[PDB]
Amino acid sequence: MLRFVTKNSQDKSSDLFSICSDRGTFVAHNRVRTDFKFDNLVFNRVYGVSQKFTLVGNPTVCFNEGSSYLEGIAKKYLTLDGGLAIDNVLNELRVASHAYNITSWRWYDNHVALLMNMLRAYHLQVLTEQGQYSAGDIPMYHDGHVKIKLPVTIDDTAGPTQFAWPSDRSTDSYPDWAQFSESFPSIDVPYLDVRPLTVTEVNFVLMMMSKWHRRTNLAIDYEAPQLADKFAYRHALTVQDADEWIEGDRTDDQFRPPSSKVMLSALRKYVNHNRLYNQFYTAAQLLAQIMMKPVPNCAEGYAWLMHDALVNIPKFGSIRGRYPFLLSGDAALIQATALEDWSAIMAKPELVFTYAMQVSVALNTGLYLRRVKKTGFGTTIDDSYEDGAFLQPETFVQAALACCTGQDAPLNGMSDVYVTYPDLLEFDAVTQVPITVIEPAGYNIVDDHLVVVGVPVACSPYMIFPVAAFDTANPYCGNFVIKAANKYLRKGAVYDKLEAWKLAWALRVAGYDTHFKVTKFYADNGDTWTHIPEFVTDGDVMEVFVTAIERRARHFVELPRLNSPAFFRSVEVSTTIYDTHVQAGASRINLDYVKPVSTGIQVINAGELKNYWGSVRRTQQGLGVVGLT
Amino acid sequence: MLRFVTKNSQDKSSDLFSICSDRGTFVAHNRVRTDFKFDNLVFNRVYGVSQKFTLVGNPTVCFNEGSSYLEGIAKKYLTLDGGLAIDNVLNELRVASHAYNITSWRWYDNHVALLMNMLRAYHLQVLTEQGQYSAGDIPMYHDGHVKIKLPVTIDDTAGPTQFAWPSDRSTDSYPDWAQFSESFPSIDVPYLDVRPLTVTEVNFVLMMMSKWHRRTNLAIDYEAPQLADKFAYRHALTVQDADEWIEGDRTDDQFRPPSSKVMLSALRKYVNHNRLYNQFYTAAQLLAQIMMKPVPNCAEGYAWLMHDALVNIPKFGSIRGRYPFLLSGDAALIQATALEDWSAIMAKPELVFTYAMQVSVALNTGLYLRRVKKTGFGTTIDDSYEDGAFLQPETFVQAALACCTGQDAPLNGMSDVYVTYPDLLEFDAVTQVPITVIEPAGYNIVDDHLVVVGVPVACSPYMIFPVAAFDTANPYCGNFVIKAANKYLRKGAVYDKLEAWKLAWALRVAGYDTHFKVTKFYADNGDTWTHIPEFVTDGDVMEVFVTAIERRARHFVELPRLNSPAFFRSVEVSTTIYDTHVQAGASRINLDYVKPVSTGIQVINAGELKNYWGSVRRTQQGLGVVGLT
């Protein structure tokens, strides 16, 4: 995850932003300078381009059965090829079978749900103490023309301002827990080791073991039942503050949730003690992938925002506190990527939020990129693009990321886990958008409802600028030249679709709107980005007519008559970012703090694609899932 | 003096401004263009920077005893090494001793006070006929915050609008004068030869022989008693118009002071006839050095303006009209610098005023430069800077000029004459400034009084731009580059003090104010120059923190986030002057008119440092008084 953010070490550094949001949303400002080079002299415009992101979401959770993983177990009981040694654990058990039949049969170690719960609680408490925790509210689209407003399940103003405990006292049951220090396990039941945790951190862990009530519209407050019906924890001291709060003995005031630092320390201690590096890596990946979506500045863009995601979080199971000697020894085949990403998150916890911000934009753009690159602008005859990585729900987000940006998207590192949108597997997926009553201008409104085909572009690429989405030079590349039209006639300046869009974008930045035929280039002011129109994607057309290029009221850098001969000059456009700052209502990272803990940790760089330890690579032939090498 | 103004012949030319001032002060406008070169393309801002100068002053005069000089005497009675030949004058006297005992013993030729009186009267009459002669008035400092207002000894509005005679009729006595044409002197008393002067010019000379009453706050209207108690002038015609005005015979209307042209012609005739080139050169130097001070645009800057100067003008004595044959023959060892500067002033009389304007700025800046260069920003361990030229009061102004600007400051050319500030010999000199009652912002106000240490910078260098005050590139140099910070941390962008000031100045010009720690950069609008803050001078600090660089209301050329990595670009700044004009309420000079009169004038380029015929040179080791070579 860290390498993806740093673009494989851009000058061995990158930048991060902490989580901040008001009313469930936050703007993401930018400052850029766009050049215009014609007549061998340079003009420029410095403009502020913003981008709205929202934390509001309602994903569908699926706490179904999942496989077991024993990576953070001592090297002498695990093995790369020999796997789990049941003979060694029976010998060291201290007949054998008499313990086998009791509990030694399950072997269902998996804490992904617990780690995800602790992470989302940390994020929610961060928002709480920043004075910004509240019920979500999706923004409205006021543009004089057709207006969009969406509902929320919980009202913002009545919504809670404080992150209380997820579960509600005196309404639902809790898992039955009791401290357990016996060497010999007695009941087949998850045993989780929390020995080195303080009273408050172990209290927080076992309280988050309970079930989760949703009290807000945010995407990370999803519903979650109790991870285990019964369980026991390996701790020297018997903790019952949570138990006292379960009954009326402890009041709400005296059992307030801890501060963000305490939850972060609890998570660090838990993962370090149980050697849960890969499991936490998967948990962070999933939480970031479900974190948020970008608020569109166009009308048809909200169709992407209407969709809800489906997540496969595995059912919880912990065999690490059953036997004290499991963790005695260096951990077995811990992935190097997991170690470095874990060190990066623990050093800077905002890395997960920044990666979520990058991944939302990359995925939303890459879905459009794949719906276009399948047909290749309609000059691909067969189906030899091999976009099949989009099919299996696990490599959905990874394939979208790889298609949008050339970088290797990081696989989830875990089997039967994914974040997927089932209804958007196919690119000819129609969506309906509830729409208020205002006269139209060619937004193909049907029965007072925007009909949207496929998935729309809903964000500017200004947080991943070198995206290289297209092969040719374009605004996504950043620097491009504007060439003369293919041939000039009465209708005017036959232009190829992609080059026509490039010209339209450059003129819209420069202050001239353009008129097309087979009518203008509806864009956004705040975000002077002009999203690619449907004439590029439809593939029925290959040349387009630009009739007239007019002057907007907000004039800017002056250009000649581009759409006519003897007056056109081959201007070229280059933009650079001056200042970016995610405000609402930064922290530099370099590869100096990446150095992971290698003391008593066996590290394998190689991975097997069966467990999804790899990275999907986009090539010209198409996407492709590649191992970690 | 001329070479100092022309910077040793800048393209063999320079520029001058005539004296002009309203209410005792005059602005000094400028127009400059500041560049900003980053991303291989150039931005610029063209802004008007002004500077206020005031003629108001109250120097302390000291008409004490001084040495005698016989330079403009015939070559056969003076000698470079043999000196005054008393045998030759006794032979040519036409016993000898019988004339010795009478008058031939004194030999006290010195007219410096008379020449200075005629020059200041010329300047005052110029101001009078320009409709700008009035009582002085020091400007007030209105800035919303703490405000400064200073008093004046004579009220402006009640102050006279016309330059009347210095002395007051029917209040004080006058020197007793009578025409004298005898070959044989009778009484030991100064005898000054005014033979070729007209009636009005000789009248003006002998009237200025009287004592001077101050009727204005200007610095050149200083008090002066009558130069000689008794004297007689060598003139063919007995002039008594001044005598008639002494009594009631002549009214005020009929004895108005002459026009500026008449006084200038009188001075030219007097100095040419008596061969007073060196004496006039010293008089012009002194008058220019006391002319004026720059009005600061900062608060603590007025402390320099509060100070008063101490001047050593020698007591008058003239042995040149005693014997008609003294001036018969070519003059003896006249300095070449004196001749060329005399020719330049007579051709253009505004050279003295322009040199005064240059010298005020150079001296005020160089005092700060020496108070800093002694410690070398606090990385000099010993006292091996050899600033001892500042100690003796005679080479005070010269040392300040040499320290500010690399050019050789011209020595006074005369012994026991100086313009000096006794209390500012030491750089740890505290001064108090009367201050009006307004809430503070960190101007260390004590008991409603600005406490100021040392001497503050009170002027912009825009009239001497290539100043080269500092060794490194800086705004004083004009062109400099802005480098990356030494190292970046949470507080932000460790910067060396000098480079931090360079960055602050460049940003303040560009429209961004900057915040420092160990708080901003208080500067002036009208004069966008930002004076060097105390963190540069204190020498306790060597690195400074720049926290944030904000955008002012009056935005200008846009720059990226300079104080952060991945966003900083090494901008470079260069400024050039577009138009300068000294307005209130120019005259080009080239080295074509410099050609001095060499007919019957013996000229020596070499000089002896005993009589202060040299030029103090600043080197890296320190200052140093160097002869004329």
SS (HEC) of B299-352:
CCCHHHHHCCCEEECCCCECECCCCHHHCCCCEEEEEHHHHHHHHHHHHCCHHH
Give the best residue of A588, A590, A592 to mutate against chain B (max B CB count within 10 A): A588
CA distance A26 to B503: 33
Chain B CB contacts of A582 below 8 Å: none
CA distance A526 to A446: 28
CA A5 vs. chain centroid, Å, equals 12
Question: Which residue type is seen at B271?
Answer: V
From B41, B559, B561, residue closest to A42, measured CB to CB: B41
Cα torsion angle, B190, B191, B197, B202, sign: positive
Alpha carbon distances (Å) from B540 to A561, B92, B231, B375, B537:
62, 71, 62, 11, 9
DSSP state for residue B296 in the 8-state scheme: P
A564 phi, psi to nearest 5 deg: -135, 145
CA B180 vs. chain centroid, Å, equals 38
DSSP state for residue B372 in the 8-state scheme: H
CA distance A304 to A292: 12
Tokens 């172990």 map to which residue? A202
Helix (H) or strand (E) holding B604: strand B601-604
Tokens 């949703």 map to which residue? A214
CA distance B404 to B370: 8
* B561 to A576: CB separation less than 8 angstroms, yes or no: no
Q: How far away is chain A from the Cα of B561, in angstroms, using its nearest Cα? A: 6
CA distance B300 to B433: 8
Q: Which pair of tokens denotes residue B208?
A: 């200025």
CA distance A360 to A616: 17
Residue B132 makes CB contacts below 8 A (sequence gap 6+) with B20, B21, B22, B584, B585
Residue B160 makes CB contacts below 8 A (sequence gap 6+) with B133, B134, B135, B215, B216
Classify strands B601-604 and B145-148 as parallel, antiparallel or unpaired. unpaired
SS3 B510: helix
Q: Measure CA of the first residue to CA of the last residue in chain A; give whole Å.
A: 16
Tell me the residue length of chain B: 629
A76 CB-contact burial (10 Å; exposed 0-12 / middle 13-18 / buried 19+): middle
Alpha carbon distances (Å) from A577 to A38, A55, A148, B551:
21, 25, 31, 17
CA distance A575 to A36: 9
From A35, A46, A588, residue closest to B558, measured CB to CB: A46
Helix (H) or strand (E) holding B627: strand B623-627
Alpha carbon distances (Å) from B552 to B344, B493, B513:
47, 21, 6
Q: Which pair of tokens denotes residue B427?
A: 């750089």
B400 CB-contact burial (10 Å; exposed 0-12 / middle 13-18 / buried 19+): buried
Give the residue from chain A lying closest to B39, CA to CA: A576
Do the beta carbons of residue A420 and residue A400 sit within 8 Å? no
Q: Which residue intervals of B374-435 are DSSP H helices?
A: 396-404
Chain B CB contacts of A43 below 8 Å: none
DSSP state for residue A523 in the 8-state scheme: -
CA distance A402 to A409: 5
SS3 A47: strand
Chain A CB contacts of B559 below 8 Å: 578
Give the residue from chain B lying closest to A575, CA to CA: B39
- Technique that determined the structure: cryo-EM
Q: Is B59 left (phi over 0), alpha (psi -120 to 50) or beta?
A: beta
Provide the b/e sequence for A492-510 (b: ≥16 CB within 10 Å): bbebbbbbbbbbbbbbbbb
Tokens 């720049």 map to which residue? B546
CA distance A297 to B504: 38
Q: How far away is chain B from the Cα of A580, in angstroms, using its nearest Cα? A: 9
Q: How far away is chain B from the Cα of A591, in angstroms, using its nearest Cα? A: 14
What's this structure's resolution in Å?
Answer: 3.2
CA distance B367 to B574: 26
CA A14 vs. chain centroid, Å, equals 18
Q: How far away is chain A from the Cα of B39, in angstroms, using its nearest Cα? A: 9
CA distance B297 to B523: 8
* A31 to B560: CB separation less than 8 angstroms, yes or no: yes
Cα torsion angle, A425, A427, A429, A431, sign: positive
Q: How far away is chain A from the Cα of B477, in angstroms, using its nearest Cα? A: 29
Long-range contact list for B348-351, CB < 8 A, 24+ apart?
B348/B16, B348/B587, B348/B589, B348/B593, B349/B122, B349/B264, B350/B16, B350/B17, B350/B18, B350/B19, B350/B587, B351/B1, B351/B2, B351/B5, B351/B16, B351/B589
Chain B CB contacts of A33 below 8 Å: 39, 558
CA distance B39 to B47: 23
Q: How far away is chain A from the Cα of B621, in angstroms, using its nearest Cα? A: 44
Chain breaks in chain A (C to N over 2.5 A) after: 94, 518, 585
Give the best residue of B40, B41, B571 to mutate against chain A (max A CB count within 10 A): B41
Give the best residue of A9, A29, A578 to mutate against chain B (max B CB count within 10 A): A578
SS3 A54: strand
Q: How far away is chain A from the Cα of B487, in angstroms, using its nearest Cα? A: 13
Chain B CB contacts of A46 below 8 Å: 558
Chain B CB contacts of A577 below 8 Å: 567
CATH class of A1-629: alpha beta
CA distance B600 to B591: 22
CA distance B511 to A13: 30
| B402 CB neighbour count, 10 Å cutoff | 28
Give the residue from chain B lying closest to A11, CA to CA: B566
Tell which residue, A373, A505, A531, has the closest CA to residue A452: A531
| B371 CB neighbour count, 10 Å cutoff | 21
B624 phi, psi to nearest 5 deg: -170, 130
DSSP for A396-423? HHHHHHHHHSSS-EEP-SSTT--EE-GG
Tokens 């004895």 map to which residue? B255
DSSP state for residue A35 in the 8-state scheme: E
Give the residue from chain B lying closest to A35, CA to CA: B41
Residues belonging to chain A with any Cβ–Cβ distance to chain B shorter than 8 Å: 11, 13, 15, 31, 33, 35, 42, 44, 46, 576-579, 586, 588
Helix axes A112-129, A260-274, angle to 10 degrees: 160
Q: Is B377 left (phi over 0), alpha (psi -120 to 50) or beta?
A: left
CA distance B180 to B231: 10
* A31 to B488: CB separation less than 8 angstroms, yes or no: no
Nearest-5° angle of CA B151, CA B152, CA B154? 145
CA A98 vs. chain centroid, Å, equals 47
Give the residue from chain A lying closest to B559, CA to CA: A578
Long-range contact list for A102-108, CB < 8 A, 24+ apart?
A102/A185, A102/A186, A102/A187, A102/A188, A103/A185, A103/A186, A103/A187, A103/A188, A103/A189, A103/A322, A105/A188, A106/A188, A106/A317, A106/A319, A107/A68, A107/A70, A107/A319, A108/A68, A108/A190, A108/A317, A108/A319
Helix axes A277-290, A260-274, angle to 10 degrees: 140
A61 CB-contact burial (10 Å; exposed 0-12 / middle 13-18 / buried 19+): middle
From B39, B488, B564, residue closest to A576, measured CB to CB: B39
From B39, B561, B565, residue closest to A579, measured CB to CB: B561
Number of helices and strands in chain B (H, E): 14, 27
CA distance A580 to B451: 43
Question: Which residue type is seen at B29?
Answer: H
Chain A CB contacts of B555 below 8 Å: none
Do the beta carbons of residue A622 and residue A387 sit within 8 Å? yes
CA distance A246 to A67: 32
